[PDB]
Structure 1
């Protein structure tokens, strides 16, 4: 149906916007601390602590499968990256502090993204 095609176009447009957002967020992580899943070789007990691991590569895979239906779902995964890190690592660590900085700098990007999704009507 034409309605189905229209819905699919909207999702493709949302995916394009979220791709730009993801690239911008990842730019705020120049150390690439959040680029890949936390290694279970370097951190053997990680899954005893963190029940829902997340990272930018995993988000990008979901993104390109058009697996984010709205901005909220995308933000939930971004928040997991940050929140997991601030639980596993102590305040004095380079890991915790990277998550704080990514959260702060990312908030700016996500604030305008919400405005764009609403205004253009992508969900």
Structure 2
């Protein structure tokens, strides 16, 4: 598809730190530290976090919006799957899903006007 890549990517950049300002606890800023949680990789197939998303974006791994949205969702779904319901992590994830949802809804509308 033909849409101009460069405007799409700055859209993704802007969107990404809009997602990140919703994560006020900085819980999802960086990969889940295998240092503090050795078992994290046991049941979680594909880890994800905002810095890895930043890396993927700049490495041109996001060529459409749906893959960007899929990687955001992984962050939420990974966290709900690993942590028990009565954790700081789980509850902050519940709240990220709702608030991130709103951010993405608006960014998707803007991406759809491009191609």
TM-score (norm 1): 0.88
Matched, 1:108 2:102: yes
Are residues 1:88 and 2:82 paired? yes
Unpaired runs of 5+ residues, structure 1, are 1-6
Structure with a larger share of its residues in helix: 1
C-alpha separation in 2, matches of 1:97 and 1:29 = 12
Q: When the two structures are superposed, what TM-score results if normalisation uses the length of structure 2?
A: 0.94
2:46 corresponds to 1:46 = no
Structure 2 segments unaligned to the other structure (5+ residues) = none
Write the distance in 2 (CA, Å) between the matches of 1:74 and 1:27.
Answer: 17
Give the number of aligned pairs: 115
Q: How big is the shift at 1:66? A: 2.2
CA contact (8 A) 2:4 2:114 kept: no
Higher Rg of the two aligned structures:
1
Q: Which residue of 2 aligns with 1:62?
A: 56
Q: CA deviation at 1:101?
A: 0.8
Aligned to 1:99: 93
Structure 1 outlier segments of 4+, above 4 Å: none
